[PDB]
């Protein structure tokens, strides 16, 4: 259905572990899109060909204003091509670098959109397991959009990078469910307000200890409504974390998030 012939390749949009993302335009419709390239050599050597097919199937069946659309895909003699929706405002990661911290309005709005998207994700019983600011893009009106889906799967499961966003049941090799995403939401909220995630360390081996113990402290400026929600999401026992409906209705979310 799709071949590389059908697009014109603009500038690079970012580097992934297995290749680049380029700006691109469909020649006959003039549609603007992002076109992720992955190299088959490196995909074979790493052994993720089947894992990538799992990402591609889960993502093409999702449609939500805060999930990044996958339109299609194709491959050739040496590479695989994912045709993704183009997010014109870049990543949340670069927004943090430029501003250092976020105010409570931006944070509570981002947490809302994140929780909405993860609610829909769970209704199709999909778990993302890897929401990093690296993987949260921003639409042309500033809306938050989840991307990647590289390490995502169906609940439950038990299948690299930094430990920082992984919950304790995952880093301990144990079995994990849909509350993996609730711990992740707690980590982002912290990082959005503070400028660094709550378990950062300069070594992998200490981030392990600090996640496992849940050893973290708030600085002065974090108001008590935000300490309340974060502490309720960063709980070693998965069952003691709330569900997304409680998050969407937390007094701190409602007072600071923007309206529908
Ligand atoms: N649709 C897009 N629009 C703009 N920038 C993007 C888009 N998709 C990705 N990027 C940028 O390119 C980078 C790499 O993309 P991505 O995270 O999807 O690759 P990856 O992490 O290597 O995926 P994989 O799990 O398959 O190895 C991102 O960190 C982001 O900065
Ligand atoms: O055997 C293949 O031709 C092949 C196909 C694909 C591929 C094609 C469509 C979708 C998708 F997710 C992956 N990925 C690969 C990765 C490494 C080595 C070979 C391949
Ligand atoms: Mg094959
Ligand atoms: Mg990524």
Numbering used by the authors: 127 to 285, 290 to 390
Sentences from the paper on this structure:
In general, it can be seen that adding halogens at the position X is predicted to be favorable. The discrepancy is possibly due to force field inaccuracy, crystallization conditions, or a small population of alternative conformations may not be visible in the X-ray electron density. As predicted, compound 9 also shows enhanced activity relative to 2.
Aurora A is one of three human aurora kinases, a family of serine/threonine kinases that play a central role in cell division. Interruption of the Aurora A–TPX2 interaction reduces kinase activity, leading to mislocalization of Aurora A, mitotic defects, and cell cycle arrest. In previous work, some of us have described the development of small-molecule inhibitors targeting the TPX2 binding pocket of Aurora A.18 In particular, through a process of high-throughput screening of diverse chemical libraries and fragment deconstruction, the fragment 2-phenyl-4-carboxyquinoline (compound 1) was developed.
